[PDB]
């Protein structure tokens, strides 16, 4: 509706920081060289660096003469300023220390939460601003070897389960270098080696090279103890940035980027808008430099109308239509609400019966178990516009028994449904395993955990789940079956909106390069597809082949893209290779391709909890929704470098209010997912979920995927 002024985590930089003279040069590393000479890297390819000091290099190089700050493209101007700020004592190291004077590290169990600041420079129009963003690292205070109780057959299990986010810090090194453990390509098997020679060698290596003194040696042995030959070596690589290094679990600790991922921890890392604001002001007061302003910048933003919140609606079997946003005599019954779909996969027309499974975690108290089955019984009834299984879902043996019992009742059946009540304690892995295995049996499942069961009860009937939750449970199940249970009072100015995800994996007669999810201009998901690709030549995915297969695959699925207008999106920035690949598919098929960078991982924060969007540095930041329950500061989606591709030609465009509206709508298609945390446009979000399921061994039922069944979500 109206505009508003909000404080953001940027502070104006004084122009007196701009360097008088810049020196261009053409040829440890080139990045470190540029850095040591108080400069940056211009052309990573042609090894072109720009320095503000007299280049000192005992190697070959040709000075490309001097240059002025005005000639550098914006990106490099900001990068050069970032480096200059560091020279005045304003860097992540210094300011992270200042932050910890106010927000101290805190330990939970064996883990320590470490606050620090991530810094960058943004050029708004003619000015430069320093972005100071508070983040957190989660570091084990126990070595990986100690964490797994020195058991080889527990260590490998650890690596596999935390594979996606686990990093390992070599605390036995003065550089505390961080690594990423290597894995058996296309698998979850970590690359380990029980060769005692490897272990002895690298263990001794640390001592010889870093603590070669009686005193340092003593401390080393006090801290890590003698070499444990029973531990295998971990093949890994640098986390920063092809080399591969060996690590000893006895000398490394697991580390995690909090923002990239328990309960008590999660809390501590979530900072309310006012807390971040204050902490930043504290750091600013402690910074004894005039090179940057002393207060945080404010910016005028555009609010988003409450009306744009009611464009998605559902209806009952009568004639009532209400938008997703939630006395009568019948309000006493446990009957679930009635939802009348706008579209139902034609598949259900033929289907005979649909077996119904109620899976109860034996760990749940009897009364919780009874509550759940009664909730599920009513959910299935409304589901229509029974086998009860009780086992120890927190044990591998219980899960195996469930699958066996269900497979036995599903033979000769086309589709089944499983409603699962489980304790909150189950690992993410066990939940995923349960769901994937049931699906191999053509059984779609819906999980309701103990937390929802105990804390979301209707105020007027404690033996009934909340009305809000009930609607969303019904929405979730319906979406898993490809049902168009809602209608969008909006039309996208595109033929199709497509989300893609690039993640190489190998499957039985497949070798898949990624996925793609398609929605029509009406806001309905229609097709979900894997993107088969041949073996890669160079260390890079051939996007021309990728997109060509995307188009051909959709055709196999009954949708021809050539001659149409589509919005194509991915998680993050559109790479040069992806643009080429898109120019390729544009000319070859006469596809008018509109695309842009959709960035969820950036450091910019607006200290207000409300829906809005604003232009900063040429990019648009959009907060799709405010935090209604959880603690924390909203994370904006960053939109930038929009472009149009016609007949193989690229024309850089400008982001419009309409574009922000589209992204906004696409972000509101969460399909019942309680606790709206989907920070990405639905097409992209689901593409990523599908790519994940394929990498996790989920069966690929093209029959279901062709009707938009989100069964893996």
XYZ file of C-alpha atoms in Angstrom:
713
model
C 0.000 0.000 0.000
C 2.057 2.878 1.372
C 5.808 3.345 1.785
C 7.784 3.140 5.010
C 11.237 3.804 6.426
C 13.175 0.848 7.748
C 16.657 0.513 9.174
C 18.898 -1.946 7.319
C 22.269 -3.506 8.183
C 24.336 -1.138 6.007
C 26.549 1.778 7.006
C 27.752 4.439 4.593
C 31.465 4.422 3.793
C 33.313 7.758 3.578
C 34.485 8.575 0.040
C 37.892 9.544 1.393
C 38.626 5.809 1.374
C 38.642 5.741 -2.426
C 42.293 5.320 -3.562
C 44.112 8.043 -5.482
C 45.800 5.625 -7.894
C 45.088 2.036 -8.949
C 47.686 -0.125 -10.727
C 46.704 -2.820 -13.234
C 48.944 -5.872 -13.687
C 48.897 -9.008 -15.725
C 50.557 -12.206 -15.204
C 49.734 -18.480 -2.088
C 47.753 -17.505 -5.198
C 46.704 -14.668 -7.503
C 43.954 -13.748 -5.038
C 46.436 -13.662 -2.170
C 48.877 -11.710 -4.318
C 46.281 -9.063 -5.125
C 45.365 -9.027 -1.411
C 48.892 -8.620 -0.037
C 49.363 -5.648 -2.360
C 46.141 -4.034 -1.092
C 44.309 -4.830 -4.296
C 41.853 -7.212 -5.924
C 41.486 -9.548 -8.920
C 39.946 -8.109 -12.099
C 40.092 -10.963 -14.612
C 40.447 -14.414 -12.953
C 40.981 -15.874 -16.424
C 43.640 -13.529 -17.796
C 45.137 -13.241 -14.292
C 44.534 -9.473 -14.240
C 44.878 -7.768 -10.857
C 44.387 -4.173 -9.688
C 46.531 -2.908 -6.808
C 46.590 0.350 -4.829
C 50.269 -0.121 -3.951
C 53.556 -0.699 -5.775
C 53.300 -4.340 -6.861
C 55.911 -6.533 -5.183
C 56.247 -9.868 -6.956
C 59.418 -11.872 -7.538
C 57.760 -13.403 -10.584
C 56.931 -12.498 -14.178
C 54.306 -9.857 -14.972
C 53.485 -6.927 -17.239
C 52.115 -3.687 -15.764
C 49.049 -2.679 -17.775
C 49.591 0.875 -16.579
C 47.660 2.874 -14.006
C 43.889 3.209 -13.907
C 41.334 5.283 -12.011
C 38.604 4.050 -9.658
C 36.026 5.475 -12.075
C 36.987 2.986 -14.772
C 36.402 -0.146 -12.674
C 33.013 -1.819 -13.053
C 30.855 -1.475 -9.922
C 31.532 -5.020 -8.698
C 35.277 -4.401 -8.603
C 34.857 -0.915 -7.132
C 33.024 -2.445 -4.158
C 35.521 -5.296 -3.921
C 38.412 -2.852 -3.900
C 36.681 -0.836 -1.144
C 36.104 -3.987 0.907
C 39.872 -4.598 0.775
C 40.546 -0.948 1.675
C 38.208 -1.133 4.679
C 40.323 -4.034 5.961
C 43.434 -1.848 5.786
C 41.788 0.528 8.234
C 41.097 -2.251 10.708
C 37.547 -2.868 9.514
C 37.277 -6.540 8.628
C 35.421 -9.693 9.597
C 38.148 -10.683 12.039
C 38.143 -7.388 13.958
C 34.365 -6.795 13.933
C 33.538 -10.431 14.788
C 35.622 -9.970 17.939
C 33.745 -6.760 18.743
C 30.413 -8.599 18.303
C 31.401 -11.322 20.766
C 31.899 -8.614 23.366
C 28.096 -8.286 23.358
C 26.853 -11.610 21.935
C 29.080 -14.297 23.444
C 29.700 -17.860 22.234
C 27.414 -20.285 24.020
C 27.771 -24.024 24.451
C 24.919 -26.510 24.209
C 25.936 -30.083 24.980
C 29.141 -30.794 23.053
C 28.568 -27.907 20.647
C 29.554 -24.256 20.819
C 27.588 -21.572 18.958
C 30.018 -18.932 17.721
C 28.696 -15.518 16.603
C 30.681 -13.606 13.989
C 30.039 -11.122 11.192
C 29.968 -11.572 7.447
C 30.923 -8.381 5.564
C 30.481 -7.065 2.025
C 30.226 -3.787 0.107
C 27.240 -2.697 -1.959
C 27.218 0.327 -4.275
C 23.761 1.852 -4.090
C 23.870 4.535 -6.774
C 26.999 6.668 -6.378
C 27.738 5.685 -2.757
C 29.378 2.658 -1.137
C 27.879 0.841 1.834
C 29.319 -1.742 4.179
C 26.952 -4.607 4.954
C 27.522 -6.015 8.445
C 25.628 -9.261 8.868
C 25.542 -11.364 12.019
C 25.932 -15.117 11.438
C 26.772 -18.193 13.517
C 29.075 -21.196 13.339
C 28.265 -24.357 15.338
C 31.442 -26.180 16.391
C 31.866 -29.426 18.289
C 34.127 -29.140 21.332
C 34.842 -32.875 20.912
C 36.928 -34.382 18.121
C 35.074 -36.420 15.505
C 36.843 -39.550 16.827
C 35.696 -38.863 20.415
C 32.132 -38.053 19.260
C 31.691 -41.480 17.720
C 33.252 -43.261 20.687
C 36.312 -44.314 18.672
C 34.131 -46.809 16.799
C 34.844 -47.187 13.049
C 31.324 -48.585 12.698
C 29.719 -45.391 14.022
C 32.091 -42.899 12.433
C 31.060 -43.880 8.917
C 27.423 -43.683 10.023
C 28.013 -40.152 11.300
C 29.641 -38.990 8.044
C 26.769 -40.391 5.991
C 23.961 -38.838 8.047
C 25.487 -35.341 8.317
C 26.894 -35.498 4.794
C 24.970 -32.517 3.394
C 26.177 -29.906 5.891
C 29.138 -31.396 7.764
C 32.487 -29.669 7.634
C 35.592 -30.628 9.586
C 38.006 -28.207 11.210
C 41.590 -29.363 11.793
C 42.111 -28.076 15.331
C 45.464 -29.869 15.354
C 46.580 -27.191 12.892
C 47.535 -23.564 13.678
C 45.434 -22.498 10.684
C 42.296 -24.354 11.811
C 41.727 -25.071 8.126
C 38.183 -26.243 7.382
C 37.481 -29.228 5.137
C 34.625 -31.073 3.435
C 34.817 -34.885 3.645
C 34.883 -36.682 0.266
C 32.235 -39.238 -0.633
C 31.959 -42.251 -2.935
C 30.618 -40.376 -5.978
C 26.844 -40.686 -6.467
C 26.622 -42.389 -3.060
C 26.619 -41.642 0.686
C 29.609 -43.880 1.407
C 32.381 -41.696 2.851
C 35.867 -42.204 1.417
C 37.701 -43.884 4.296
C 40.932 -45.938 4.495
C 42.006 -48.161 7.383
C 45.662 -48.189 6.297
C 47.606 -47.553 9.532
C 50.470 -46.072 7.503
C 48.297 -43.227 6.221
C 47.164 -42.531 9.783
C 50.647 -42.638 11.294
C 52.097 -40.458 8.538
C 49.577 -37.621 8.707
C 49.416 -37.721 12.506
C 53.207 -37.385 12.645
C 53.012 -34.753 9.916
C 51.213 -32.285 12.217
C 53.818 -32.620 14.937
C 56.860 -32.349 12.642
C 55.526 -29.326 10.749
C 53.625 -27.447 13.482
C 54.609 -28.429 17.029
C 58.226 -29.564 16.695
C 59.203 -28.600 20.256
C 59.196 -30.499 23.568
C 56.639 -28.062 24.994
C 54.359 -27.994 21.957
C 54.710 -31.779 21.613
C 53.626 -32.266 25.204
C 50.544 -30.100 24.745
C 49.711 -31.875 21.500
C 49.805 -35.248 23.259
C 47.868 -33.836 26.208
C 45.164 -32.532 23.867
C 44.920 -35.333 21.305
C 46.749 -38.230 22.922
C 48.891 -40.793 21.109
C 47.958 -41.819 17.578
C 45.015 -44.188 17.515
C 45.741 -46.742 14.802
C 42.208 -48.125 14.880
C 40.837 -44.953 13.274
C 40.489 -44.816 9.488
C 41.715 -41.831 7.466
C 39.157 -39.460 5.914
C 39.751 -38.388 2.329
C 38.659 -34.761 2.028
C 39.202 -31.425 0.332
C 39.413 -27.756 1.243
C 36.125 -26.101 2.155
C 37.203 -22.678 0.861
C 37.837 -21.585 -2.746
C 41.545 -30.587 -7.159
C 43.791 -31.751 -4.322
C 42.253 -34.102 -1.741
C 43.700 -34.216 1.780
C 43.697 -36.967 4.416
C 42.190 -36.158 7.806
C 42.381 -37.941 11.138
C 39.025 -38.004 13.035
C 41.196 -37.828 16.143
C 42.414 -34.380 15.128
C 39.305 -32.764 13.632
C 36.024 -31.398 14.910
C 32.705 -31.221 13.098
C 31.650 -27.663 12.206
C 28.475 -26.224 10.685
C 27.263 -22.916 9.249
C 24.187 -22.408 11.451
C 22.327 -20.409 8.810
C 22.891 -23.248 6.322
C 21.040 -25.809 8.452
C 18.425 -28.607 17.144
C 16.050 -26.698 19.398
C 17.919 -24.795 22.091
C 20.649 -23.991 19.587
C 18.262 -22.829 16.885
C 16.895 -20.335 19.394
C 20.231 -18.701 20.219
C 20.960 -18.164 16.518
C 17.630 -16.488 15.872
C 17.838 -12.770 16.558
C 14.830 -10.454 16.601
C 15.036 -7.372 14.324
C 15.741 -5.106 17.317
C 18.467 -7.367 18.726
C 20.433 -7.426 15.454
C 19.959 -3.658 15.219
C 21.308 -3.086 18.720
C 24.220 -5.540 18.343
C 25.269 -3.783 15.138
C 25.036 -0.384 16.833
C 27.238 -1.777 19.631
C 29.867 -2.857 17.138
C 29.687 0.516 15.445
C 30.198 2.378 18.725
C 33.242 0.190 19.432
C 34.765 0.825 15.977
C 37.208 3.703 16.455
C 37.273 4.871 12.829
C 35.633 7.696 10.905
C 36.062 5.911 7.567
C 32.450 4.676 7.993
C 29.352 6.413 9.353
C 28.435 5.801 12.989
C 24.794 4.905 12.409
C 22.905 2.348 10.313
C 21.323 3.541 7.058
C 17.565 3.764 6.665
C 15.739 3.149 3.401
C 12.300 3.799 1.964
C 10.482 0.573 1.190
C 7.164 -0.353 -0.420
C 4.683 -2.229 1.744
C 2.631 -5.041 0.203
C -1.181 -4.803 0.186
C -3.162 -7.129 2.448
C -5.218 -7.826 -0.671
C -2.375 -9.745 -2.330
C -2.755 -12.114 0.627
C -6.174 -13.306 -0.491
C -5.589 -14.392 -4.085
C -5.550 -18.115 -3.275
C -8.871 -19.688 -2.300
C -10.547 -23.022 -1.506
C -14.216 -24.018 -1.433
C -16.621 -26.495 0.189
C -19.271 -28.786 -1.347
C -21.827 -25.994 -0.988
C -20.892 -22.722 -2.644
C -18.632 -21.043 -0.099
C -15.245 -19.682 -1.181
C -12.727 -18.439 1.370
C -9.064 -17.441 0.851
C -6.328 -19.340 2.708
C -6.567 -17.432 6.003
C -8.142 -19.099 9.050
C -22.266 -20.892 16.724
C -23.040 -23.482 14.037
C -24.827 -26.500 15.512
C -22.570 -29.016 13.706
C -19.367 -27.580 15.239
C -19.425 -30.352 17.852
C -18.329 -33.202 15.563
C -14.781 -34.335 14.761
C -15.628 -34.219 11.041
C -12.789 -32.659 9.038
C -13.624 -29.608 6.928
C -14.839 -30.341 3.406
C -12.711 -29.170 0.501
C -14.065 -29.341 -3.036
C -11.203 -29.542 -5.598
C -11.170 -27.593 -8.857
C -9.316 -30.465 -10.532
C -8.627 -34.109 -9.682
C -6.112 -36.263 -11.610
C -8.045 -38.387 -14.097
C -6.103 -41.318 -12.641
C -8.438 -41.525 -9.634
C -11.460 -42.078 -11.891
C -10.429 -45.658 -12.726
C -8.619 -46.658 -9.497
C -10.632 -49.276 -7.594
C -9.837 -49.017 -3.883
C -7.127 -47.125 -2.034
C -5.797 -49.063 0.988
C -5.476 -46.847 4.090
C -2.657 -47.322 6.599
C -2.435 -45.821 10.096
C 1.161 -46.150 11.290
C 1.670 -45.567 15.000
C 5.024 -45.031 16.635
C 4.870 -47.465 19.571
C 6.941 -44.957 21.511
C 3.974 -42.573 21.768
C 1.778 -42.762 24.877
C -1.403 -44.769 24.343
C -3.617 -41.664 24.525
C -1.587 -39.860 21.857
C -1.841 -42.978 19.665
C -5.641 -43.021 19.999
C -5.884 -39.293 19.294
C -3.888 -39.639 16.055
C -5.817 -42.591 14.642
C -9.053 -40.702 15.322
C -7.630 -37.608 13.608
C -6.500 -39.726 10.652
C -9.875 -41.461 10.402
C -11.634 -38.126 9.976
C -8.964 -36.843 7.615
C -9.538 -39.758 5.244
C -13.312 -39.264 5.325
C -13.066 -35.684 4.060
C -10.303 -36.981 1.790
C -13.224 -38.636 0.019
C -14.976 -35.490 -1.206
C -8.098 -49.623 7.149
C -5.007 -51.255 8.618
C -3.454 -50.078 11.880
C 0.229 -50.798 12.338
C 2.071 -50.121 15.589
C 5.870 -50.446 15.769
C 9.002 -48.823 17.177
C 9.557 -46.189 14.489
C 12.772 -45.149 16.234
C 14.492 -48.449 15.485
C 15.620 -49.925 12.178
C 13.865 -53.175 13.078
C 10.548 -51.415 13.643
C 10.734 -49.617 10.323
C 11.579 -52.849 8.495
C 8.498 -54.498 10.067
C 6.266 -51.590 8.955
C 7.405 -51.794 5.334
C 6.959 -55.593 5.278
C 3.446 -55.391 6.717
C 2.461 -52.642 4.288
C 4.042 -54.350 1.248
C 2.045 -57.444 2.136
C -1.252 -55.502 2.004
C -0.256 -53.490 -1.087
C 0.583 -56.291 -3.527
C -1.598 -56.051 -6.604
C -2.588 -52.519 -5.605
C -1.992 -49.317 -7.523
C -2.078 -46.806 -4.680
C -2.117 -46.647 -0.927
C -2.057 -43.933 1.740
C -0.222 -43.981 5.046
C -0.866 -41.626 7.961
C 1.999 -41.677 10.414
C 2.156 -40.459 14.011
C 5.732 -40.307 15.307
C 7.732 -38.939 18.231
C 9.704 -35.755 17.549
C 12.896 -37.689 18.378
C 13.179 -39.551 15.066
C 16.179 -38.432 13.035
C 15.527 -36.786 9.660
C 17.022 -39.916 8.132
C 14.530 -42.314 9.725
C 11.575 -40.186 8.660
C 12.949 -40.034 5.097
C 13.657 -43.792 5.084
C 10.114 -44.588 6.233
C 8.556 -42.403 3.531
C 10.827 -43.556 0.694
C 10.324 -47.267 1.456
C 6.555 -46.911 1.648
C 6.570 -45.112 -1.659
C 8.486 -47.975 -3.297
C 5.251 -49.784 -2.488
C 3.046 -47.142 -4.154
C 2.113 -45.744 -0.748
C 2.037 -41.971 -0.319
C 2.477 -40.903 3.300
C 1.719 -37.993 5.631
C 3.534 -37.554 8.927
C 2.179 -35.739 11.979
C 4.684 -35.515 14.851
C 4.023 -35.586 18.588
C 4.492 -31.796 18.883
C 1.585 -31.022 16.584
C -0.566 -33.627 18.324
C 0.029 -32.199 21.796
C 0.105 -28.451 21.077
C -2.326 -27.800 18.215
C -5.589 -28.989 19.775
C -8.862 -27.132 19.163
C -9.716 -24.863 22.115
C -13.302 -26.122 22.256
C -12.470 -29.828 21.928
C -9.126 -31.121 23.180
C -9.769 -34.429 21.420
C -9.592 -32.601 18.129
C -6.759 -30.982 16.201
C -6.847 -27.238 15.464
C -8.868 -26.013 12.484
C -5.801 -24.304 10.996
C -3.734 -27.483 11.214
C -6.577 -29.682 9.966
C -6.940 -27.616 6.791
C -3.209 -27.695 6.124
C -2.921 -31.442 6.774
C -5.660 -31.904 4.190
C -3.850 -29.505 1.787
C -0.559 -31.404 2.195
C -2.081 -34.814 1.442
C -4.061 -33.445 -1.505
C -0.928 -31.904 -3.026
C 0.918 -35.214 -2.679
C -1.807 -36.691 -4.904
C -1.601 -33.901 -7.495
C -5.040 -32.519 -6.573
C -5.790 -28.903 -7.595
C -7.671 -28.117 -4.387
C -7.321 -24.343 -4.722
C -7.749 -21.571 -7.276
C -5.484 -18.584 -7.848
C -7.190 -15.248 -8.587
C -4.234 -14.275 -10.729
C -2.710 -15.049 -14.113
C 1.022 -15.111 -14.837
C 1.986 -13.384 -18.079
C 3.784 -16.574 -19.123
C 2.872 -19.866 -20.754
C 4.755 -21.780 -18.060
C 6.881 -20.927 -15.034
C 9.732 -23.389 -14.682
C 12.034 -24.168 -11.765
C 15.189 -26.199 -12.379
C 17.849 -27.698 -10.128
C 21.291 -28.812 -11.244
C 22.754 -31.667 -9.194
C 24.559 -34.577 -10.914
C 23.703 -38.079 -9.690
C 23.741 -41.616 -11.101
C 20.836 -44.044 -11.138
C 20.058 -47.472 -12.584
C 20.192 -46.754 -16.319
C 19.950 -43.012 -15.832
C 22.840 -40.764 -14.782
C 20.663 -37.725 -14.068
C 21.883 -34.156 -14.175
C 19.025 -32.533 -12.291
C 15.350 -31.739 -12.374
C 12.652 -29.330 -13.525
C 9.231 -28.423 -12.192
C 6.573 -26.749 -14.296
C 3.565 -24.645 -13.302
C 1.015 -23.208 -15.740
C -0.043 -19.529 -15.905
C -2.845 -20.453 -13.519
C -0.502 -21.290 -10.638
C -0.907 -25.075 -10.802
C 1.995 -27.500 -10.847
C 1.608 -29.744 -13.908
C 4.854 -31.602 -14.570
C 7.888 -32.792 -12.581
C 10.800 -34.335 -14.472
C 14.292 -35.817 -14.083
C 16.898 -34.565 -16.515
C 18.875 -37.456 -17.944
C 22.292 -36.469 -19.312
C 25.217 -38.377 -20.777
C 28.636 -38.626 -19.141
C 30.244 -35.218 -18.630
C 33.410 -34.424 -20.568
C 34.923 -31.447 -18.776
C 34.427 -30.729 -15.082
C 31.168 -28.901 -15.792
C 27.598 -29.829 -16.732
C 26.716 -29.221 -20.390
C 23.739 -26.909 -19.985
C 22.984 -27.052 -23.712
C 22.400 -30.788 -23.316
C 20.607 -30.189 -20.000
C 17.990 -27.756 -21.302
C 17.608 -29.632 -24.582
C 16.753 -32.719 -22.529
C 14.433 -30.598 -20.368
C 12.426 -29.578 -23.432
C 12.399 -33.094 -24.868
C 11.439 -34.589 -21.512
C 8.468 -32.250 -21.072
C 7.352 -33.197 -24.575
C 7.529 -36.844 -23.549
C 5.278 -35.691 -20.696
C 2.757 -34.063 -23.099
C 3.889 -30.428 -23.002
C 5.737 -28.766 -25.877
C 7.684 -25.666 -24.867
C 8.920 -24.501 -28.267
C 6.971 -21.444 -29.479
C 6.070 -20.416 -25.925
C 6.933 -17.782 -23.342
C 8.392 -19.082 -20.086
C 9.889 -17.745 -16.869
C 12.798 -20.007 -15.966
C 14.254 -19.858 -12.471
C 16.867 -21.636 -10.370
C 18.146 -21.462 -6.768
C 20.635 -18.615 -7.017
C 22.402 -16.743 -9.792
C 22.018 -17.694 -13.459
C 25.514 -18.806 -14.552
C 27.114 -17.939 -17.898
C 26.792 -21.581 -18.921
C 23.118 -21.581 -17.974
C 22.540 -18.442 -20.006
C 24.290 -20.021 -23.007
C 22.285 -23.173 -22.511
C 19.191 -20.984 -22.437
C 20.167 -19.101 -25.602
C 20.607 -22.542 -27.168
C 17.119 -23.786 -26.260
C 15.664 -20.382 -27.212
C 16.856 -20.412 -30.821
C 16.497 -24.140 -31.442
C 12.908 -24.248 -30.167
C 11.875 -20.603 -30.607
C 11.317 -20.277 -26.864
C 11.073 -16.760 -25.434
C 12.985 -17.196 -22.156
C 12.693 -14.757 -19.257
C 15.019 -15.365 -16.308
C 16.776 -13.648 -13.395
C 18.912 -14.282 -10.299
C 16.819 -15.474 -7.339
C 19.163 -15.325 -4.371
C 18.188 -16.558 -0.923
C 21.740 -16.507 0.441
C 22.864 -12.927 0.827
C 23.761 -10.815 3.899
C 21.286 -7.914 3.542
C 18.718 -7.554 6.326
C 15.883 -5.046 6.942
C 15.119 -4.622 10.624
C 11.328 -4.839 10.546
C 8.977 -7.814 10.583
C 6.644 -7.020 7.694
C 6.063 -7.755 4.016
C 7.920 -5.328 1.755
C 10.373 -4.921 -1.123
C 12.962 -2.286 -2.037
C 15.690 -1.439 -4.533
C 19.217 -1.569 -3.190
C 22.278 -1.416 -5.354
C 20.331 -2.339 -8.476
C 18.774 -5.458 -7.003
C 15.308 -5.860 -5.506
C 14.934 -7.330 -2.019
C 11.602 -8.900 -1.205
C 10.239 -10.140 2.121
C 7.331 -12.462 1.052
C 5.842 -12.741 4.530
C 6.413 -11.761 8.146
C 7.355 -14.197 10.907
C 4.043 -14.996 12.611
C 5.193 -17.518 15.216
C 8.936 -18.170 15.199
C 11.632 -15.808 16.489
C 14.127 -14.135 14.155
C 14.535 -11.574 11.378
C 12.898 -12.064 7.943
C 15.243 -13.173 5.191
C 14.611 -11.292 1.941
C 14.806 -12.963 -1.430
C 17.256 -11.049 -3.616
C 16.199 -10.542 -7.261
C 18.667 -9.265 -9.866
C 20.128 -9.216 -13.393
C 16.833 -9.990 -15.082
C 17.081 -10.648 -18.814
C 15.012 -11.758 -21.805
C 16.184 -14.325 -24.325
C 14.603 -14.331 -27.786
C 15.829 -16.198 -30.854
C 19.064 -16.969 -29.025
C 19.743 -13.341 -28.148
C 20.103 -11.895 -24.647
C 18.740 -8.481 -23.698
C 19.421 -7.349 -20.124
C 16.124 -6.128 -18.700
C 14.939 -4.338 -15.568
C 12.944 -5.846 -12.707
C 9.425 -4.419 -12.372
C 6.754 -4.281 -9.708
C 4.894 -6.916 -11.722
C 7.956 -9.184 -11.557
C 8.060 -8.778 -7.777
C 4.353 -9.620 -7.700
C 4.975 -12.826 -9.682
C 7.817 -13.946 -7.393
C 5.604 -13.039 -4.464
C 2.745 -15.217 -5.676
C 5.091 -18.100 -6.526
C 6.382 -17.873 -2.974
C 2.893 -18.279 -1.501
C 2.360 -21.698 -3.103
C 3.495 -23.773 -0.071
C 0.847 -26.533 -0.213
C -0.145 -26.714 3.477
C 3.426 -26.723 4.791
C 2.772 -25.473 8.327
C 5.376 -22.933 9.452
C 5.896 -21.133 6.135
C 9.679 -21.107 5.760
C 9.774 -21.665 2.000
C 12.100 -18.806 1.057
C 11.972 -19.752 -2.629
C 9.444 -19.550 -5.464
C 7.482 -22.830 -5.406
C 8.754 -23.994 -8.827
C 12.359 -23.714 -7.663
C 11.597 -25.096 -4.222
C 10.012 -28.260 -5.543
C 12.643 -28.745 -8.244
C 15.194 -28.869 -5.414
C 13.071 -31.261 -3.364
C 12.744 -33.610 -6.333
C 16.464 -33.477 -7.165
C 17.023 -34.369 -3.492
C 14.648 -37.344 -3.545
C 16.280 -38.708 -6.713
C 19.674 -38.424 -4.993
C 18.131 -40.188 -1.999
C 16.912 -43.240 -3.943
C 13.225 -42.374 -4.290
C 11.381 -44.299 -6.968
C 10.619 -42.161 -10.017
C 6.933 -42.794 -10.819
C 6.590 -40.804 -14.027
C 2.894 -41.639 -13.946
C 2.474 -39.609 -10.744
C 5.056 -36.981 -11.703
C 3.163 -36.256 -14.952
C 0.144 -35.099 -12.943
C 2.164 -32.984 -10.541
C 2.031 -35.411 -7.580
C 4.388 -33.979 -4.918
C 4.852 -37.449 -3.384
C 8.520 -36.961 -2.504
C 7.817 -33.681 -0.679
